[PDB]
Amino acid sequence: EKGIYQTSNFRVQPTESIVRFPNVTNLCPFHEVFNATRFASVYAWNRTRISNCVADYSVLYNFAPFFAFKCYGVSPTKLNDLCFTNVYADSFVIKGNEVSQIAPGQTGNIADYNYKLPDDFTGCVIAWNSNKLDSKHSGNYDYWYRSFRKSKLKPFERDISTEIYQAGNKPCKGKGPNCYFPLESYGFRPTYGVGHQPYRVVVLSFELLHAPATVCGPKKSTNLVKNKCVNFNFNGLTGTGVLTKSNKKFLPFQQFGRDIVDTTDAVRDPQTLEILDITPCSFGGVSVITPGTNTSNQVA
Amino acid sequence: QIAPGQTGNIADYNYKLPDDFTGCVIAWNSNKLDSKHSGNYDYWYRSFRK
Amino acid sequence: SKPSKRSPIEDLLFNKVTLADAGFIKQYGDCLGDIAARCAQKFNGLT
Amino acid sequence: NTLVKQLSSKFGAISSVLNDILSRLDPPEAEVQIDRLITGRLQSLQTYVT
Amino acid sequence: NTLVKQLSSKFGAISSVLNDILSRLDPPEAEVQIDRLITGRLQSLQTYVT
Amino acid sequence: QSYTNFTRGVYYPDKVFRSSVLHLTQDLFLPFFSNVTWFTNGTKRFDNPVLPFNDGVYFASTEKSNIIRGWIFGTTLDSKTQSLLIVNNATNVFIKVCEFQFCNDSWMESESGVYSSANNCTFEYVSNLREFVFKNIDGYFKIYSKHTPGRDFPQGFSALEPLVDLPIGINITRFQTLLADYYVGYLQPRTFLLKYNENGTITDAVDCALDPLSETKCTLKSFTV
Ligand SMILES: *[C@@H]1O[C@H](CO)[C@@H](O[C@@H]2O[C@H](CO)[C@@H](O)[C@H](O)[C@H]2NC(C)=O)[C@H](O)[C@H]1NC(C)=O
Ligand SMILES: *[C@@H]1O[C@H](CO)[C@@H](O)[C@H](O)[C@H]1NC(C)=O
Ligand SMILES: *[C@@H]1O[C@H](CO)[C@@H](O)[C@H](O)[C@H]1NC(C)=O
Ligand SMILES: *[C@@H]1O[C@H](CO)[C@@H](O)[C@H](O)[C@H]1NC(C)=O
Ligand SMILES: *[C@@H]1O[C@H](CO)[C@@H](O)[C@H](O)[C@H]1NC(C)=O
Ligand SMILES: *[C@@H]1O[C@H](CO)[C@@H](O)[C@H](O)[C@H]1NC(C)=O
Ligand SMILES: *[C@@H]1O[C@H](CO)[C@@H](O)[C@H](O)[C@H]1NC(C)=O
16 A cells, blocks of 8 residues: 555675784693693692683593583583683592582582582583593592581682581590591592592683683684774674774773663774774664555655 | 584584484493404494594 | 744743754764764664 | 663573674574573563553 | 462462572572562563553 | 771772763772771881771872881781782882791881792782772782872872782681781772763762762762752
């Protein structure tokens, strides 16, 4: 029928794609934790930090097959894009039946007394079966775990106290009148079953919310197009828009900017440190004006 | 690894189900008849892939 | 004598009321300043 | 102002930004996080229109 | 009376009482059950206001 | 000693540039008009105070000689502590971390601490009002500063930019100063309405729980009601 109808929407498509990752250092310090000769006890789990490095996760797939590989907030195969902004890595040895306890929100003697992940946890828990290296025919007693504590642990706390714990009512000193040593050894043996065999667990802990990053990006960068509708990837922030020269007085402190409604409207180029504004590519509704089928097939 | 959403040498290079796959994955232990003391060399996996 | 040929009272009535939506070809504003917020500034699909 | 500001809400998702969900997660997990955002966005739009 | 009555509904949750959900379940499932009760109660308020 | 009265301790809570907005955010801040403890007892001896950490602290020196330069944080302040020794001619420089067994706390002299071994981490970084206003909180000790040149407070508004965010990872139950007119306060969870300028700077703030008015201002997200 004669009239004006709103039928669709125009979008300006990008013509080029860009990636602007920071200068690559070619440092990938991941074999130091995965390929270490000794791992820490779970009661005193080890912690390292990764900064000013570039990661390539194929190396750990080259390192070994794994018993378990569970990521929260991120999936495998997506770690070759920007994957970290602040990097820690925890390392410990645990029992097979307790491997399921290294996960957000779990309870048990390790989740409660030795090592706990926050409920709001982003990262990957990688478990390798280590019987060949950690078990001894007499039992490997270098690994200790805490069995007694007065209260539950909080996320990422490390309780390394060895003070005697009492389960009874009469305050005792020393060991054996209801006073017990808080740690117990586990003698790992080659003859134990899968759930009792030793496992080496590495937990990669990071946050993807912060604007700057000093880690990740095996991807090659491109040249910086400006004043043209393009796709872009700036330190893991992806989108479509027109990039322009900025006159915003960013502090050396600030990395990203946002508009009145808390959506990104500016970035600091990771290689040039120039401030660029982001204007989304033009779009809008499209309406068709027709005299109607019974008059003419011309439209505006 | 024979399940939707899994990764590994088979899920990546030999046999991957759709992530919206429907149907049944049935498996059983064949050691009694399939294995040989000299080794059964009739089975192999691609083990790498671009 | 005035553009739009409004009466003095109409001129006051229009000057007193502040219009936040300001419908026009919003692309004219372009950028070069902090976003006005006029309330999606088109970009979030609200026009 | 309220309808636009609702875009920044998570509604239980890991991130309020759809591109971050698509970048971080593979399809089968992204679909769940996206469905959570879609539900929130429909509630916001239906309330606005009402 | 309808709004108060709706507080006793489960809306698909295992329990209508938040303290029972938090006491009996682990945080991971408890957040889902709470999100279901929040969705139902928020819909009840939106219906009342409309 | 005595207590003072000021509206200080505002800092940029995040790394995101904002301008010409009123931003309502929740973080740990020194509350407005919160009791602040104000501080030559040593002369030639020590007798320095030891303070709690609670959730986090605000500290601001205005001392020509920078007599207080470093700090020790820890669960008990015994032999296994976090000795955050910071000696600075510059704003912040020569940071040290983790435990040392003994401390240095000699007229117009300053002695170094002597320890037998470092059995834990080591970290380093090298760089009339000279107000070293800063904040201490979280798994990383985010130290902020602002220098706005007598030494009495103007009782104005000024925001603090971050200076350093070195990793820490320790309990930090207690706090004490390291010495060779100081203000020390404590942070609490608070929601603030922060006013941003045309430039990337904060010019004012409303403490959303101080009084009924400020709460109304936060409810409306405006400095005018
Ligand atoms: C933000 O900083 C700029 C300088 O980087 C300030 O620019 C001044 O603007 C006034 C008024 O236009 C001029 O008279 C000055 O000469 C400018 N200074 C310089 C160094 O060019 C700007 O005013 C600042 N904005 C605010 C809100 O303080
Ligand atoms: C590192 O991994 C390789 C894998 O072949 C192994 O041979 C080597 O011994 C490992 N390094 C150490 C110190 O064990
Ligand atoms: C623990 O991590 C540190 C990181 O610097 C490393 O030097 C040390 O050898 C590790 N120890 C064990 C037992 O893994
Ligand atoms: C940290 O110190 C507090 C002292 O208030 C203590 O209660 C808590 O158990 C300590 N935690 C660890 C992991 O040392
Ligand atoms: C990256 O390297 C280039 C080499 O030309 C240099 O000009 C640029 O400043 C570097 N950027 C950073 C952030 O190091
Ligand atoms: C369209 O863009 C041209 C660019 O030269 C400008 O002169 C004109 O005023 C613009 N018109 C509108 C309606 O935006
Ligand atoms: C608080 O009281 C002190 C008393 O010396 C005074 O100097 C200060 O100006 C007062 N603050 C305000 C904001 O009135």
